[PDB]
């Protein structure tokens, strides 16, 4: 009715938003760091070329015209 002021009630569900699915932590391998600053050593061999300067080894004996 016109002159009756309407009163809207409140329905019980709360209508949340929707978050994405998170799976990229499963992608990369992980290990907990007990120190906030550290270093990793990279051991690499060399060949002195017998004429001076050195070349990194396992990426310079791969091409067949040696």
């Amino acid at each position: 009715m016109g002159p009756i002021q309407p009163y809207a009630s409140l329905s019980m569900p709360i209508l949340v938003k929707l978050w994405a699915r998170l799976a990229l932590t499963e992608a990369l391998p992980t290990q907990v760091a007990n120190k906030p600053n550290f270093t990793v050593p990279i051991l690499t061999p060399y060949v002195v070329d017998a004429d001076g300067n050195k070349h990194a080894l396992p990426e310079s004996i791969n091409n067949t015209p040696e």
């Binding site: 809207a8 569900p13 949340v16 978050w19 699915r21």
Partner: protein
């Protein structure tokens, strides 16, 4: 960084240098040393070498650059250590409400005199009011379902065709196989709209329903015929046919429950998300009430002087968030074997 002769090799001119994988990160004692090779000429590949010896006290916040060559500027990238609280991020809850007001819809009536009831009971033995109640009861029932199609028509247009993925029944001009199997490709525009809706709304609990004309939804199961002995007495007047109107489908993308109805126009499918979470709400039909006024009380509008029946249907349908997509099926008129 940018020296006095450097090429960008992204917007190639006298500009900066991308330090690709030879960035100068902060070492021990907060120093920055890097032996880098910047390009100088694009068609020359001069590759002038230099070095950036740098130090900066972190708590003292001042940097200190030197270089043996020739520098103009260095584009740096660091942050402020957020130990001392000077800038954090706040989160707060916001709440609004949406109204689901239901109102008086149009009531249908049937003006019924007295000398027209005995005129049907005598000649044709027609009940004048039991042929007018079910006339009204079928008009109100089809008024609801014609409004639902009007609801999904208008409240798809407010998505600005965000999921309008078309389809052709005519195969491409270099297909060269049976066009019966080209209708299998309808299932990969359906599963393409479906995965496109679970990526812009992030919901994974759907029951995607498809409403469409039974001409159009027939291409989805793509069923073949079976044959039997044509006995003339044991014919079955559509005894097992139900897969052109109400069929369940289970893809690898999402599950389905398609709906075939002849009320919608031929040429367009329509996908609708329905989630099982009671929190999220995509589309909802709200039937309020439905009652018949048996004769007494309410008058008539066309001719008030005679008694009349009365029936109304109070209902509304609402769209909280419009996850609805439209698949325009093109050239589906059975004329593929005529071109």
């Amino acid at each position: 960084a940018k020296w006095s002769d450097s090429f960008d090799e992204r917007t190639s001119a006298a500009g900066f240098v991308e330090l690709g994988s030879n960035v100068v990160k902060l070492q021990d004692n907060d120093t920055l040393v890097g032996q880098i090779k910047y390009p100088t000429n694009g068609d020359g590949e001069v590759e002038t070498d230099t070095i950036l010896g740098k130090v900066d006290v972190s708590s003292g916040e001042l940097t200190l650059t030197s270089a043996s060559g020739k520098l103009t500027d260095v584009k740096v990238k660091g942050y402020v250590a957020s130990e001392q609280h000077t800038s954090a991020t706040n989160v707060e809850l916001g709440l609004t409400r949406k109204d689901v007001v239901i109102d008086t819809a149009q009531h249908i009536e049937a003006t019924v005199p007295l000398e027209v009831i005995q005129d049907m009971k005598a000649t044709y033995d027609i009940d004048g009011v039991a042929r007018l109640s079910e006339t009204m009861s079928q008009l109100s029932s089809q008024k609801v379902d014609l409004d639902i199609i009007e609801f999904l028509d208008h409240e798809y247009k407010e998505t600005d065709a965000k999921y309008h993925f078309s389809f052709d029944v005519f195969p491409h001009s270099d297909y060269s196989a049976h066009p019966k199997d080209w209708l299998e490709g309808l299932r990969e525009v359906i599963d393409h709209t479906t995965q496109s809706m679970k990526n812009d709304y992030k919901l994974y609990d759907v029951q995607f329903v498809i409403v469409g004309n039974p001409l159009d939804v027939r291409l989805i199961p793509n069923v073949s015929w079976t044959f039997n002995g044509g006995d003339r007495n044991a014919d079955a007047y559509s005894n097992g046919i139900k897969i052109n109107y109400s069929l369940g489908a289970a893809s690898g993308t999402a599950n389905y429950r398609i709906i075939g109805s002849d009320l919608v126009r031929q040429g367009e499918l329509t996908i609708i998300a329905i989630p099982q979470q009671d929190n999220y709400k995509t589309f909802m039909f709200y039937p309020y009430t439905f009652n018949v006024v048996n004769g007494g009380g309410y008058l008539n509008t066309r001719n008030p002087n005679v008694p009349n029946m009365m029936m109304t249907r109070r209902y509304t349908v609402e769209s909280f968030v419009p996850i609805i997509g439209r698949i325009t099926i093109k050239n589906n008129n059975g004329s593929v074997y005529a071109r």
